[PDB]
């Protein structure tokens, strides 16, 4: 619902960040046979949205230190473009065998 | 329609329109309020602008302000010019925060 509402009308980066989060969390803690599945999903979605908010506006990073002094961090396209290129090869490899 | 008309007319006469805008509307009651505030003078179009901003309807708020910007090119009153200047500045700030697509949709007549 978060992602959902955030969209509703006229939302962008917000969506992106919510997506990232969901994803990372998922993995880090549950990940075993399907966390993989859904995290892959998450980030795929975020990537969609952020690719979209055209850098007419240019942006992303987050600011705090609570429930990982778990301070949030940035991007610049990069940061987790890395994260999902990565988790994609992770899936193709977990693919041919288990 | 008659009861909503009476409610909105009496709230306007008694100065209660700002408290009315805090209520939860159905799509029907909302459609009728939009029709009423559009017909009932320039001050009610500024209240409708505030309602669109409070409801996060930034596209309708920007389009309404462009309509108001086109209708006020001839006002002799200094107080209405200062108010329209402030209104324009606030909405031009909201317009800068919007995604490029929502800006395009707000700038497309």
Curated annotation (Swiss-Prot), chain B:
Cellular compartments annotated: Nucleus, Nuclear pore complex; Cytoplasm; Nucleus, Nucleoplasm
TM ranges: none
Domain notes: The N-terminus forms a highly conserved seven-bladed beta propeller decorated with long loops and mediates anchorage to the Nup107-160 subcomplex of the nuclear pore, synergistically with the central alpha domain. The disordered C-terminus is responsible for the interactions with chromatin.
Function recorded in the entry: Required for the assembly of a functional nuclear pore complex (NPC) on the surface of chromosomes as nuclei form at the end of mitosis. May initiate NPC assembly by binding to chromatin and recruiting the Nup107-160 subcomplex, which may in turn recruit membrane vesicles containing pom121 and tmem48/ndc1. Association with chromatin may require the presence of the mcm2-mcm7 complex, suggesting a mechanism for coordination of nuclear assembly and the inactivation of replication licensing.
Assembly and binders: Interacts with the Nup107-160 subcomplex of the NPC.
Similarity section: Belongs to the ELYS family.
Protein name, as recorded: Protein ELYS
Organism of derivation: Xenopus laevis
Region of the whole protein represented: 904 to 1012 of 2408
């Amino acid at each position: 619902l978060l992602y959902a509402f955030h969209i509703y009308r006229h939302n962008y980066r917000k969506a992106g960040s919510v997506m990232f989060e969901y994803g990372m969390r998922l993995g880090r803690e549950v990940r075993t046979l399907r966390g993989l599945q859904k995290q892959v999903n998450s980030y795929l979605a975020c990537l969609n949205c952020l690719r979209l908010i055209r850098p007419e506006y240019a942006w992303i990073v987050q600011p705090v230190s609570g429930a990982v002094s778990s301070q949030i961090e940035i991007l610049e396209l990069r940061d987790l473009e890395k994260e999902y290129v990565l988790a994609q090869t992770r899936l193709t490899l977990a693919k041919h065998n288990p | 329609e008659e009861l909503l008309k009476h409610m909105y007319e009496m709230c306007q006469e008694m100065g209660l329109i700002e408290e009315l805008l805090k209520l939860t509307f159905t799509d029907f009651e909302q459609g009728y309020l939009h029709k009423f505030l559009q017909t009932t003078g320039v001050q009610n179009q500024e209240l409708l602008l505030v309602h669109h901003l409070q409801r996060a309807n930034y596209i309708s708020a920007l389009q309404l302000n462009q309509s108001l910007k086109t209708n006020h090119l001839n006002d002799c009153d200094r107080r209405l010019r200062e108010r329209s200047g402030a209104r324009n500045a606030i909405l031009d700030q909201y317009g800068k925060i919007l995604p490029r697509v929502q800006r395009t949709l707000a700038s497309e007549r």
